[PDB]
């Protein structure tokens, strides 16, 4: 059995990569994948800087 995180990430990453609810999906991705806190900070700072 595939780790269930894969199914979870397929849904989250599809949404994110299609530009839908990207700040939320970025939080989820960085959490699910257990990124080191410094990388997470960098990723979420760049997400916030996306101009509408």
């Amino acid at each position: 059995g595939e780790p269930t995180e894969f199914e979870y990430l397929r849904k989250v990453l599809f949404e994110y990569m299609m530009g839908r609810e990207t700040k939320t999906m970025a939080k989820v991705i960085t959490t699910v994948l257990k990124f080191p806190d410094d990388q997470t900070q960098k990723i979420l700072e760049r997400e916030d800087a996306r101009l509408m």
Binding site: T4, E5, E7, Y8, R10, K11, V12, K23, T24, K27, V28, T31, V32
Partner: protein, 163 residues
């Protein structure tokens, strides 16, 4: 308005979402991810997020908390063994700064069953009378039959309309 539907796996979250959207029971599978639909009640639109409740994915619920106006917390009234789990998830979530001002409605679901706990036991087990700085109510629901939903939603909407 943004609403989260939370609760353990099997509680009836997804069944409630589509009952609210299309007034019918739908077949479900365990939600490994989330469902999102906009729902129209009393000429008003809510974006409702139904988050999966399986053990391994419960920890990700907090990722979705930013800008939440209300939580519908769905609890299987027949599941006496895991009401303690629901209570610990409810305590943990209400400590989150992001939900400081959120309205909490608890749906004591599966009340169509004879094995259902009463609204009263459930409030006590969930620690609801002890909650401070919180607007909250509990309601008896069956997502399959349809009972109690229209009335819980009347309360949530009016409470949101009043701040």
């Amino acid at each position: 308005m943004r609403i989260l539907i939370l609760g353990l796996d099997g509680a009836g979250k997804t069944t409630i979402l589509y009952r609210l959207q299309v007034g019918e029971v739908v077949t479900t599978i365990p939600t490994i991810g989330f469902n999102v639909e906009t729902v129209t009640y009393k000429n008003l639109k809510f974006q409702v997020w139904d988050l999966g409740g399986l053990t391994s994915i419960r920890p990700y619920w907090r990722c979705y908390y930013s800008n939440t106006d209300a939580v519908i917390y769905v609890v299987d009234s027949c599941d006496r063994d895991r009401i303690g789990i629901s209570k610990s998830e409810l305590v943990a979530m209400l400590e989150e700064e992001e939900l400081r001002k959120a309205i909490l409605v608890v749906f004591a679901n599966k009340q169509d069953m004879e094995q259902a706990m009463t609204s009263s036991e459930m409030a006590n087990s969930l620690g609801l009378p002890a909650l401070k700085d919180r607007k909250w109510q509990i309601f008896k629901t069956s997502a399959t039959k349809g009972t109690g939903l229209d009335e819980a939603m009347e309360w949530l909407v009016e409470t949101l309309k009043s701040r």
